[PDB]
């Protein structure tokens, strides 16, 4: 089967920045048979290019394609504001008609360090058999942050879930928020509850944490 | 100027199976047996999944290796109602699945997609969500909506009056099968001021307004 890998990643340009994205096929592929989409949050996916660079219908001028071989590539002459979304490449030469993993065209803007916030359990949670000890990273970029649960100096893992917010329309930043969760039993064994948060915009690591009985 | 719709959301339960429709709206489609149709998945986090497609005239289907046997593309000509039928459900696939066809009767560039239908597996039950607050330590706090089932719920604060700071997070899969979401604000550290956020899960007609104090 081919395979389809989409780079970057993650495309972090400005408003009205050329945007330049790339498709590579496992093996040699016909222009034709290669298709571009776009998915704008919380819509249906849209085809901006069939054939490799044929623009479909109502698909503004802005947008191009190109390549030959294993190499593909999506051009956004200037970035529009709605510009920013997610952009897959699609091979329906021969089956399975497979799909790149998508690259996502975010607003790039100056670094943000987070906002570190530390909330412990409720006392009434607590009345429940259960503990939440919540931590919050607010307003920072880029979105990529490392949040470290530490239970006594404990390197906790697979008892948090951490959720991000999209990048925010007005000042292009990112929140987080990450969530240890316990049992009464084992929450009321240990003292010390921290929040190890390490993001480029920091000098060092930033660290908050509580006591049990603060 | 063809617009697909998409039945609606499904829950369902582990070993069960869905089948999912794709209509045309307006009298913008034509001949339903006469194009090609494909479903594509796309599960949280991830990038787009072809799945398999059925050709317009003579129907013959083509899966991809990760459902053989556990999927059924079809079509209604008379009705005008494409169906994409998922069985032996697990809990990995929940996910946005999406209705997609082209312009003739073979597999091509995907030019008309639905809004896509989501699909949820659980073994959980409707469950109306536990409110426990995030009480403050600028200053940040927030509500925790912690264990309730299916999504979603809206959070507001002091009745939609504060909106200012506010993150409201996506909501999480724990182990439990249940759905644990987060909703803060940032305010001034010098307020004397009451916060109380209402959270409203329609499933279950729970309408929840729980104050923070520090």
Redesign the interface.
Known sequence: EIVLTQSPGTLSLSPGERATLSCRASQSLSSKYL?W?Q?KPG?????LI??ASSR?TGIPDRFSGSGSGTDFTLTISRLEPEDFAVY?C?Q?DG????????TTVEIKRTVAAP?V??????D??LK?GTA?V?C?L?NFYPREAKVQWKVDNALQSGNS?????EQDSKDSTY?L?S?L?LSKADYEKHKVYACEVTHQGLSSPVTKS?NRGE | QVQLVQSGAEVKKPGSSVKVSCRASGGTGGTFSAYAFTWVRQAPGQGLEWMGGITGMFGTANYAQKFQGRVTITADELTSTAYMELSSLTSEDTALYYCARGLYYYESSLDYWGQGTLVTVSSASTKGPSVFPLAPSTAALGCLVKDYFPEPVTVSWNSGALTSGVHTFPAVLQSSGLYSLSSVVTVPSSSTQTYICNVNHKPSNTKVDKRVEP
């Open positions: 298709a989409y998915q819509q249906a996916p849209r085809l069939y054939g479909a897959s699609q329906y089956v399975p008609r497979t799909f790149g993993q998508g906002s916030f530390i909330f412990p359990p409720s009434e949670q429940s939440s919540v919050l607010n879930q951490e959720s991000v917010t929140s928020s969530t969760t509580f």
